[PDB]
Amino acid sequence: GAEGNTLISVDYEIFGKVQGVFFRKHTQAEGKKLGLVGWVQNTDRGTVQGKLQGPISKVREMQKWLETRGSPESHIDKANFKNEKVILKLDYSDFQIVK
């Protein structure tokens, strides 16, 4: 088999018209495909503070799923990251949406 168990945690605030729509429902779904955790929630500025907790092996792909991809409703004109964090264990066990 192959080795590469690097668990990290990076949070960012995606831009674009991702506020006032129904994308979170799918944002948590896609996270199950790979097996990542975290949380999703909009702000009162015009962005969405989303975090990608899990193995880099998957995060490397999830970073594009939210940066380039997203949903048919909302839109993403631009996006960026803040600063990842190398951890030994994920604070969360499963992906969930914030009310």
CATH label of the domain that carries residue 88: 3.30.70.100
Q: Distance of CA 74 to CAs 8, 22, 66, 71, Å? A: 27, 8, 11, 6
What is the DSSP code (8-state) at residue 35?
A: T
| Residue found by looking up tokens 């792909």 in the block | 61
Range of the domain at 57: 1-99
**Catalytic positions, written as ranges:** 24, 42
81 contact partners, CB below 8 Å, separation of at least 6? 10, 12, 63
| Residue found by looking up tokens 């969930």 in the block | 96
Asked whether the beta carbons of 76 and 18 are under 8 A apart, the reply is yes
State the Cα–Cα distance between residues 92 and 26, nearest whole angstrom: 19
What backbone phi and psi angles, to 5 degrees, belong to 58?
Answer: -105, -40
What is the DSSP code (8-state) at residue 10?
A: E
| Residue found by looking up tokens 């999830």 in the block | 62
- H or E, element range at 39: strand 39-40
Method by which the coordinates were obtained:
NMR
State the Cα–Cα distance between residues 78 and 99, nearest whole angstrom: 25
Asked whether the beta carbons of 81 and 12 are under 8 A apart, the reply is yes
Domain count, the chain: 1
Q: Token pair of 86, please?
A: 């190398």
Q: Which amino acid is at 38?
A: G
